[PDB]
A paper describes a structure:
One of the major and widespread PTMs is acylation of the ε-amino group of lysine residues. Canonical acyllysine readers, bromodomain and double PHD finger (DPF), display comparable binding capabilities toward various short acyl chain modifications, and while the [name] domain exhibits preference for crotonyllysine, it still associates albeit more weakly with other acyllysine marks. In this study, we elucidate the significance of π stacking components in targeting of acetyllysines by the [name] domains and report a previously uncharacterized DNA-binding activity of the human AF9-[name] domain. Collectively, our results have illuminated the mechanistic basis underlying distinct recognition of acyllysine PTMs by the [name] domains of yeast [name] and human AF9, allowing us to develop a [name]-[name] module that selects for the crotonyl modification and discriminates against saturated acyl modifications.
To elucidate the mechanism by which [name]-[name] [name] distinguishes crotonyllysine and discriminates against saturated counterparts, we obtained the crystal structure of the [name]-bound [name] mutant. The structure of the complex showed that the aromatic side chains of W81 and F62 lay parallel to each other and at equal distance of 3.4–3.6 Å from the crotonyl alkene group. Remarkably, only a single r2 conformation of W81 was observed in the structure of the complex. Analysis of molecular orbitals (MOs) for the W81, Kcr, and F62 assembly at the B3LYP/6-311 + G(d,p) level of density functional theory (DFT) revealed that the bonding MOs transcending all three π systems are deeply buried, indicating considerable synergism of the π-π-π stacking interaction. Given the [name] [name] mutation impacts H3K9ac binding to a greater degree than [name] binding, these findings suggest a differential requirement of H3K9ac and [name] for the proper expression of [name]-regulated genes.
Residue numbers in the entry:
A (entry chain B): 5 to 10
B (entry chain A): -1 to 137
Write the structure that this text describes.
């Protein structure tokens, strides 16, 4: 749920 | 100065997302279907169609194909698939060429759905836009 892109 | 001749309106960005199990995870991260829509709030806080924009362009992360996606009809719903949230830029174009506003949005997977409100300043010098603004509050 906290996955994020650079 | 020139900013006096404007009114403020609150727009509400509405995001939803869920996992697609039939899509193989990327580096163990599941791929999710996500959607964004945009509505306008009136002076009582009810959602109404954001007809003050004649165009919305979602500026997606460049890991997406053709990452600049144009929509012309409310609620300007975009749907995509991904694996990692990101800040994206939403360009909203007011009627009658009255101006572009760039709205920062955060696409994330913390909730199944979540809404974010943004205040924009809108000029009062374009008759067709001014008549449209009357639907959502005082002008």
């Amino acid at each position: 749920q906290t996955a994020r892109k650079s | 100065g020139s900013m006096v001749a404007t009114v403020k309106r609150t727009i509400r960005i509405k995001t939803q997302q869920h996992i697609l199990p039939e899509v193989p995870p990327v580096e163990n991260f599941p791929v999710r279907q996500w959607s964004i829509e945009i509505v306008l709030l009136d002076d009582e806080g009810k959602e109404i169609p954001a007809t003050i924009f004649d165009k919305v362009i979602y500026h997606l992360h460049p890991t997406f194909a053709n990452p600049n996606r144009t929509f012309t009809d409310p609620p300007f719903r975009i749907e995509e698939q991904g694996w990692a949230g990101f800040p994206l830029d939403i360009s909203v174009f007011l009627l009658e060429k009255a101006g572009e506003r760039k709205i920062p949005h955060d696409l994330n997977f913390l909730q199944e759905s979540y809404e974010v409100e943004h205040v924009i300043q809108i000029p009062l010098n374009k008759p067709l836009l001014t008549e449209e603004l009357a639907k959502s509050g005082s002008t």
